[PDB]
Design a protein around this motif. Sequence first.
Motif, PDB file in Angstrom:
ATOM      1  N   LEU A   1       0.834  -1.228   0.000  1.00 54.09           N
ATOM      2  CA  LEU A   1       0.000   0.000   0.000  1.00 54.09           C
ATOM      3  C   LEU A   1       0.862   1.270   0.000  1.00 54.09           C
ATOM      4  CD1 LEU A   1      -3.032  -0.585   2.369  1.00 54.09           C
ATOM      5  CD2 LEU A   1      -3.006  -0.010  -0.050  1.00 54.09           C
ATOM      6  N   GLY A   2       2.169   1.160   0.248  1.00 54.50           N
ATOM      7  CA  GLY A   2       3.078   2.315   0.315  1.00 54.50           C
ATOM      8  C   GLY A   2       2.819   3.158   1.549  1.00 54.50           C
ATOM      9  N   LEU A   3       2.370   2.544   2.638  1.00 50.96           N
ATOM     10  CA  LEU A   3       2.120   3.265   3.912  1.00 50.96           C
ATOM     11  C   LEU A   3       3.433   3.805   4.489  1.00 50.96           C
ATOM     12  CD1 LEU A   3      -0.694   1.030   5.432  1.00 50.96           C
ATOM     13  CD2 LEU A   3      -0.904   3.201   4.196  1.00 50.96           C
ATOM     14  N   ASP A   4       4.575   3.199   4.137  1.00 54.25           N
ATOM     15  CA  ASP A   4       5.941   3.754   4.388  1.00 54.25           C
ATOM     16  C   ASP A   4       6.074   5.147   3.744  1.00 54.25           C
ATOM     17  OD1 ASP A   4       5.597   1.607   2.369  1.00 54.25           O
ATOM     18  OD2 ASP A   4       7.614   2.330   1.628  1.00 54.25           O
ATOM     19  N   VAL A   5       5.484   5.372   2.564  1.00 55.35           N
ATOM     20  CA  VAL A   5       5.649   6.646   1.809  1.00 55.35           C
ATOM     21  C   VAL A   5       4.935   7.773   2.566  1.00 55.35           C
ATOM     22  CG1 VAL A   5       5.198   7.844  -0.396  1.00 55.35           C
ATOM     23  CG2 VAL A   5       5.952   5.436  -0.389  1.00 55.35           C
ATOM     24  N   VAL A   6       3.711   7.547   3.049  1.00 49.45           N
ATOM     25  CA  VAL A   6       2.932   8.580   3.790  1.00 49.45           C
ATOM     26  C   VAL A   6       3.222   8.477   5.284  1.00 49.45           C
ATOM     27  CG1 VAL A   6       0.609   9.386   4.436  1.00 49.45           C
ATOM     28  CG2 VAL A   6       1.135   8.863   2.077  1.00 49.45           C
ATOM     29  N   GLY A   7       3.985   7.478   5.726  1.00 45.59           N
ATOM     30  CA  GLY A   7       4.391   7.345   7.138  1.00 45.59           C
ATOM     31  C   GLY A   7       3.183   7.042   7.993  1.00 45.59           C
ATOM     32  N   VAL A   8       2.364   6.087   7.517  1.00 47.28           N
ATOM     33  CA  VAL A   8       1.204   5.503   8.248  1.00 47.28           C
ATOM     34  C   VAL A   8       1.701   4.231   8.932  1.00 47.28           C
ATOM     35  CG1 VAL A   8      -1.116   4.486   8.022  1.00 47.28           C
ATOM     36  CG2 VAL A   8      -0.529   6.574   6.795  1.00 47.28           C
ATOM     37  N   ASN A   9       1.908   4.338  10.244  1.00 48.70           N
ATOM     38  CA  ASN A   9       2.329   3.240  11.141  1.00 48.70           C
ATOM     39  C   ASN A   9       1.304   2.115  11.095  1.00 48.70           C
ATOM     40  OD1 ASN A   9       4.390   4.855  11.769  1.00 48.70           O
ATOM     41  ND2 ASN A   9       3.949   4.993  13.970  1.00 48.70           N
ATOM     42  N   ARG A  10       1.833   0.894  10.978  1.00 49.69           N
ATOM     43  CA  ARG A  10       1.094  -0.389  11.060  1.00 49.69           C
ATOM     44  C   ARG A  10       1.536  -1.208  12.268  1.00 49.69           C
ATOM     45  NH1 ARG A  10       1.908  -3.671   5.772  1.00 49.69           N
ATOM     46  NH2 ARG A  10       4.053  -2.912   5.906  1.00 49.69           N
ATOM     47  N   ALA A  11       0.667  -2.081  12.758  1.00 44.68           N
ATOM     48  CA  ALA A  11       0.978  -3.070  13.815  1.00 44.68           C
ATOM     49  C   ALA A  11       1.607  -4.295  13.158  1.00 44.68           C
ATOM     50  CB  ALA A  11      -0.296  -3.422  14.562  1.00 44.68           C
ATOM     51  N   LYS A  12       2.156  -5.188  13.974  1.00 42.42           N
ATOM     52  CA  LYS A  12       2.783  -6.468  13.542  1.00 42.42           C
ATOM     53  C   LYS A  12       1.888  -7.128  12.487  1.00 42.42           C
ATOM     54  CE  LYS A  12       5.472 -10.087  13.778  1.00 42.42           C
ATOM     55  NZ  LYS A  12       6.771  -9.879  13.101  1.00 42.42           N
ATOM     56  N   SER A  13       0.577  -7.112  12.709  1.00 41.99           N
ATOM     57  CA  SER A  13      -0.449  -7.838  11.913  1.00 41.99           C
ATOM     58  C   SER A  13      -0.746  -7.147  10.579  1.00 41.99           C
ATOM     59  CB  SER A  13      -1.711  -7.948  12.693  1.00 41.99           C
ATOM     60  OG  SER A  13      -2.380  -6.694  12.707  1.00 41.99           O
ATOM     61  N   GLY A  14      -0.266  -5.922  10.347  1.00 34.15           N
ATOM     62  CA  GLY A  14      -0.510  -5.238   9.060  1.00 34.15           C
ATOM     63  C   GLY A  14      -1.667  -4.266   9.148  1.00 34.15           C
ATOM     64  N   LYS A  15      -2.338  -4.218  10.297  1.00 36.17           N
ATOM     65  CA  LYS A  15      -3.445  -3.278  10.554  1.00 36.17           C
ATOM     66  C   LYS A  15      -2.879  -1.887  10.838  1.00 36.17           C
ATOM     67  CE  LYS A  15      -6.956  -6.542  12.166  1.00 36.17           C
ATOM     68  NZ  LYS A  15      -8.379  -6.405  12.563  1.00 36.17           N
ATOM     69  N   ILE A  16      -3.646  -0.864  10.477  1.00 33.83           N
ATOM     70  CA  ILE A  16      -3.237   0.550  10.672  1.00 33.83           C
ATOM     71  C   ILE A  16      -3.524   0.946  12.122  1.00 33.83           C
ATOM     72  CG2 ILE A  16      -3.845   2.914  10.005  1.00 33.83           C
ATOM     73  CD1 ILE A  16      -4.313   1.608   7.133  1.00 33.83           C
ATOM     74  N   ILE A  17      -2.572   1.636  12.759  1.00 31.34           N
ATOM     75  CA  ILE A  17      -2.687   2.072  14.174  1.00 31.34           C
ATOM     76  C   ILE A  17      -3.358   3.444  14.223  1.00 31.34           C
ATOM     77  CG2 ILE A  17      -1.516   2.542  16.331  1.00 31.34           C
ATOM     78  CD1 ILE A  17       0.791   0.742  15.294  1.00 31.34           C
ATOM     79  N   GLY A  18      -4.481   3.484  14.928  1.00 29.91           N
ATOM     80  CA  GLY A  18      -5.378   4.641  15.004  1.00 29.91           C
ATOM     81  C   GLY A  18      -5.187   5.408  16.289  1.00 29.91           C
ATOM     82  N   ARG A  19      -5.380   6.718  16.159  1.00 26.65           N
ATOM     83  CA  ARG A  19      -5.776   7.730  17.166  1.00 26.65           C
ATOM     84  C   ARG A  19      -7.275   7.930  16.908  1.00 26.65           C
ATOM     85  NH1 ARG A  19      -1.584  10.357  16.984  1.00 26.65           N
ATOM     86  NH2 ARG A  19      -0.736  11.210  18.912  1.00 26.65           N
ATOM     87  N   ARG A  20      -8.080   7.077  17.520  1.00 21.94           N
ATOM     88  CA  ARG A  20      -9.411   6.724  16.996  1.00 21.94           C
ATOM     89  C   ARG A  20      -9.200   6.200  15.574  1.00 21.94           C
ATOM     90  NH1 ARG A  20     -12.812   8.036  21.299  1.00 21.94           N
ATOM     91  NH2 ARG A  20     -12.052   9.895  22.396  1.00 21.94           N
ATOM     92  N   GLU A  21      -9.810   6.822  14.571  1.00 22.39           N
ATOM     93  CA  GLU A  21      -9.749   6.410  13.145  1.00 22.39           C
ATOM     94  C   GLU A  21      -8.646   7.186  12.407  1.00 22.39           C
ATOM     95  OE1 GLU A  21     -12.798   7.515  14.469  1.00 22.39           O
ATOM     96  OE2 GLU A  21     -13.997   5.685  14.674  1.00 22.39           O
ATOM     97  N   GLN A  22      -8.076   8.247  12.992  1.00 23.85           N
ATOM     98  CA  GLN A  22      -6.965   9.001  12.367  1.00 23.85           C
ATOM     99  C   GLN A  22      -5.701   8.125  12.443  1.00 23.85           C
ATOM    100  OE1 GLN A  22      -5.496  12.573  14.503  1.00 23.85           O
ATOM    101  NE2 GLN A  22      -5.786  13.687  12.578  1.00 23.85           N
ATOM    102  N   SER A  23      -4.890   7.982  11.387  1.00 19.38           N
ATOM    103  CA  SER A  23      -3.574   7.318  11.544  1.00 19.38           C
ATOM    104  C   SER A  23      -2.859   7.989  12.724  1.00 19.38           C
ATOM    105  CB  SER A  23      -2.708   7.360  10.313  1.00 19.38           C
ATOM    106  OG  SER A  23      -1.396   6.892  10.641  1.00 19.38           O
ATOM    107  N   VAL A  24      -2.325   7.200  13.665  1.00 17.93           N
ATOM    108  CA  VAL A  24      -1.629   7.749  14.867  1.00 17.93           C
ATOM    109  C   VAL A  24      -0.488   8.665  14.420  1.00 17.93           C
ATOM    110  CG1 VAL A  24       0.030   5.854  15.120  1.00 17.93           C
ATOM    111  CG2 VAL A  24      -0.600   7.210  17.121  1.00 17.93           C
TER     112      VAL A  24
END
Lengths: 581, 576
Positions: free
Chosen positions: B388-411
């Motif tokens: 997904l290129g989440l490294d490019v936008v710097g969207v942190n993921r958990a071990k499992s590949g799920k996106i880590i939220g501040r609620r629904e906002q990427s942390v």
Amino acid sequence: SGSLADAVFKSACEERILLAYADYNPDMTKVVNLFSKYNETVNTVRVSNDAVKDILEIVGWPSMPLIFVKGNCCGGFKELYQLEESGFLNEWLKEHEYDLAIVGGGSGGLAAAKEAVRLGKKVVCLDFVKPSAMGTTWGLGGTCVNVGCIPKKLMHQAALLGEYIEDAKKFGWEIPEGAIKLNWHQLKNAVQNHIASLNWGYRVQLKEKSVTYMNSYATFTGSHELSVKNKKGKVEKVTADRFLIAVGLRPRFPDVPGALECCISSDDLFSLPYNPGKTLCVGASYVSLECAGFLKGIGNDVTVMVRSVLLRGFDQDMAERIKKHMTERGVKFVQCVPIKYERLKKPTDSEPGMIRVHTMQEDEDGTKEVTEDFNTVLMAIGRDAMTDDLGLDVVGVNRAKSGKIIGRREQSVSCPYVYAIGDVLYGSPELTPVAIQAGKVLMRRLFTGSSELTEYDKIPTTVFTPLEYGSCGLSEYSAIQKYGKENINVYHNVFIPLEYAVTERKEKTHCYCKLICLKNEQDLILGFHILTPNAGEITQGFAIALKFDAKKADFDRLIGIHPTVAENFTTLTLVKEGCXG
Amino acid sequence: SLADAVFKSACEERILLAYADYNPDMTKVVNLFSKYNETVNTVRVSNDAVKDILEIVGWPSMPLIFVKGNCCGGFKELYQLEESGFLNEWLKEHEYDLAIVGGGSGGLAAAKEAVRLGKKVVCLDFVKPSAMGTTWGLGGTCVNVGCIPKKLMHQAALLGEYIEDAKKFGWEIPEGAIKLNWHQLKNAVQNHIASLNWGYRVQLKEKSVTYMNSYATFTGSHELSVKNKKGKVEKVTADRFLIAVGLRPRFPDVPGALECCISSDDLFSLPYNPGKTLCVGASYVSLECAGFLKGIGNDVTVMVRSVLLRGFDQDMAERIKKHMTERGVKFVQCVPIKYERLKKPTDSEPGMIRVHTMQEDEDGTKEVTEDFNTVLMAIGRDAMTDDLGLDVVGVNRAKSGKIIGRREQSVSCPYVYAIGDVLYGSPELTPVAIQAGKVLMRRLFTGSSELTEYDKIPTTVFTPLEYGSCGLSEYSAIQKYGKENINVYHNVFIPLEYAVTERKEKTHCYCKLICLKNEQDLILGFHILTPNAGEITQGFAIALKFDAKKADFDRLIGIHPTVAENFTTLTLVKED
Ligand SMILES: Cc1cc2nc3c(=O)[nH]c(=O)nc-3n(C[C@H](O)[C@H](O)[C@H](O)COP(=O)(O)OP(=O)(O)OC[C@H]3O[C@@H](n4cnc5c(N)ncnc54)[C@H](O)[C@@H]3O)c2cc1C
Ligand SMILES: Cc1cc2nc3c(=O)[nH]c(=O)nc-3n(C[C@H](O)[C@H](O)[C@H](O)COP(=O)(O)OP(=O)(O)OC[C@H]3O[C@@H](n4cnc5c(N)ncnc54)[C@H](O)[C@@H]3O)c2cc1C
Ligand SMILES: [Cl-]
Ligand SMILES: [Cl-]
Ligand SMILES: [Cl-]
Ligand code: NA
Ligand code: NA
């Protein structure tokens, strides 16, 4: 500054004679003086001033002081002196055979019997079934068990299972090609076998708990005396310190020539030894429509004859929608009231009879007498209290025009040791679980001295029409009449139960729900209504929302279960009629 | 001044600085934004409102900065955004107000709600085929390979039991065996799915949502590169992104698994009756699928590591196991070590797989085989977010590949949001995906404080006898409060519909109510094993939103006759 309600009612239940008094005690001796006549000692409680209004509300008397006799609130000195003057108080203070006599072995009677006994009381339960005009009679457990909810639901299920067979083919079950008939004898026997098991379950349940059951019809012949007559004609006398009337109703017959000779009632329908065949259902009551519905569902030619509207007392929008649907399912609705029934044929042991039904039908060029022939006519116009022969005149239990007992809650308004629950209590909604709750709660009040009241408002129902109708709270009309068009939001939707998606069922265009909201109080939910399969199972839990003054917002923040019909109450946005910077 | 007024301003204004008293370097913000000819708006928040506003946006301390209605944090986080060049690219005009990656439950619900609020939205959806080659149209897991097809085949199974009831209520059904034609069922289900595929695709056009049947990847701070079926790559820019990309079935590192085992992605469009079936795994998917395959007359085995329905009440799980065992499902505690394909499916017939197991006998442990027509790999579902290129936008993921939220906002990125199965900690249910989407869109484009409620969510497991629940398991309640402070009220009951039948279900229907004794029997959870569990559980679930007590269940008048009214008359306490 005194003691409180629970402490008062505990004392009231524990003590033979208790006087509960407030600010003053004028005539305290007059009471003590009156009781000294029967070597009775009068116990006393000074009630806290900021507790009185609560205590008065509960017992349903205007002001203090209050007098209790054997755990029964009598009123004040005025009411006691009436009881003394009539000789009733003299007979009341005697020891009696039973703590409680229950007249009726139905939903309410049996529930009260089980709860009184659990609280360690000597109880007699009386139940007798006077036959219908067609000769039909049955065992213990009342209307619901024998000629009501249970047999009705089982035949409704027989009808649904008919529609389920056609769905089975569309989901790919290879059912051989033939037309498939419902054998009435197998259905009726399966239903009657189940009823038989309940009859016997209740009869056992009463023995297991040491309730004295008497299959005898009861009448008051003294202040504290019932005369009870068994099948064979034996008359016994039963005395009690308290009475509970849970006698219920029987089907209403109109003053029309032939009605009684020609028309079965629901009392007869569920043990008929014949397929009823071409059927006329007379009346607009839920009984008429539920019975019309299942008889169609098992393949009968069904007509419904109604005075004007269906389901008087229910939401007329929902009633009309039931009419549309049952019409599409082949039920015939005609607005006419028969003027005569004539018997053409008697039923044999295995075939139905035939009745000629007479109506006055209206041309544009004049008026015509018209006849039509039906195998069976079901008289389903309503249910009346058959209380004329109870001797309520003897105990001085006030009745309404309709024959129902008039309550101060469940206490006879005019006699403090006679109580009524269930269908026979004036204003009680006529439902099994209400009879059951009223019975159980009353018994806890009487024998525990608790402040628990049955909640008679916002009661959920389901009409088990071919497509079921579930509701709780106000109709759209009652809400608008009470609060104004301008202050009501109606949120609504149609939906297709996923089970129907793959079929070409008529139901796919009739499923509807609506939520009726008080706009000026944050869309407080006043009522909800749904037309769906499993309406009862959906409505029951949503009904608890009204006990907490639930708002639309509470329905909207509840997460659905997918896929279900019920989740539809979670996503209503349609009303019936950008950061601007 | 107060929260609603703050968030309204935040949504209405391009750049808003929310403050308490005399925060340090409010200049160095205005100075930073003056670099891009931006005007920095201001709001003095009431002290009585701060703790509320911070709880909502999920930031520790008060000086807050908003950019295009997105809470960024404090000066520290703004400077991070500036330093990386992201802030410069953020403040530019973009093609879309919102780009949604995923055309499933969450994505489509968010798309419809963003558009109703008058925003320009692009919805991207692509279905990478299963290992067996299976692919499908718009609407996501639930529509194509999940709740919808599953419930329809469950109903096919129920209708099988209903035919037998029909005979006992007196319907004269011609005598002899009645078979379920798999092809008719699968076609009826796929015809329905097709109608939904098309309904969503039309629904998007009718509302002016730009639908692109393309697989999306981040190639800039505010840029997705999206690849269609034919291999065409287009570029999509947006001021905000929503990731609603879901999960796909988990396969274990076992020889043959991927070659030999279908998943739920394949089961609902199979061009053959699956025949003798092995369901591998203890997930609700494994049991629901095992259940209906038995109900349509297949020889069904379920192979599990140890316990059924990890996460659910194990009392209820055991009861489901007993019932499905009585209905002829075979449970073995074994984990295959190899799958070997003996036959390929051909000509609308299933293939054949040899399943290898280590079983111990009176001498030791031995390799053993058994042959199945079909093996359903149903051990779990994983987020496929590596590409997904989440490294490019710097969207942190958990071990499992799920996106880590501040609620629904990427942390870690303030203009990227996630909902549905791919949000770390989000219960994996359609109506959650739907509510999260709809609520988020009202927060972002209206500036309301409305939160999705993720606690006390009712579910139903559509096993042959349905399992409905809401709130704590008996075990979780006892673990949290102590056995001494828990009342469990319970009963058995026979649905009236079964009374006249000889059904096995007549001995398995059970409900229980789990109550906090020291808080007036506050209801912590309820559990029911019954037909129509879903329909019963839904409305009772609202009781937990009002801190309902047992006494509230007791003063509710039942509807007679129903199963649901059983929650109205519980007196029996479970003792242990
Ligand atoms: C066709 C039909 C369908 C119904 N369907 C539903 C439904 O789906 N859901 C629902 O909630 N409710 C339903 N009801 C209503 C429900 O049956 C009644 O509300 C309930 O049965 C009333 O209970 P009860 O104890 O007050 O009276 P009953 O159940 O009628 O019991 C009274 C008993 O007392 C006996 N009795 C009468 N007089 C005397 C006497 N003098 N001495 C001794 N015994 C006496 C009667 O014969 C009877 O045995 C239905 C009713 C009917 C007729
Ligand atoms: C067999 C089964 C049964 C279920 N039963 C139920 C049930 O009964 N009740 C219930 O509530 N829930 C149930 N669920 C769960 C439910 O399906 C999911 O919780 C829900 O679909 C999640 O929705 P979503 O929007 O998060 O993801 P999805 O619905 O999975 O949507 C994600 C979409 O995004 C697409 N996508 C992925 N990556 C990209 C990308 N890079 N670019 C573009 N598109 C992309 C995916 O291919 C898919 O189209 C079930 C699931 C399964 C598997
Ligand atoms: Cl039913
Ligand atoms: Cl109907
Ligand atoms: Cl169906
Ligand atoms: Na989605
Ligand atoms: Na798609």
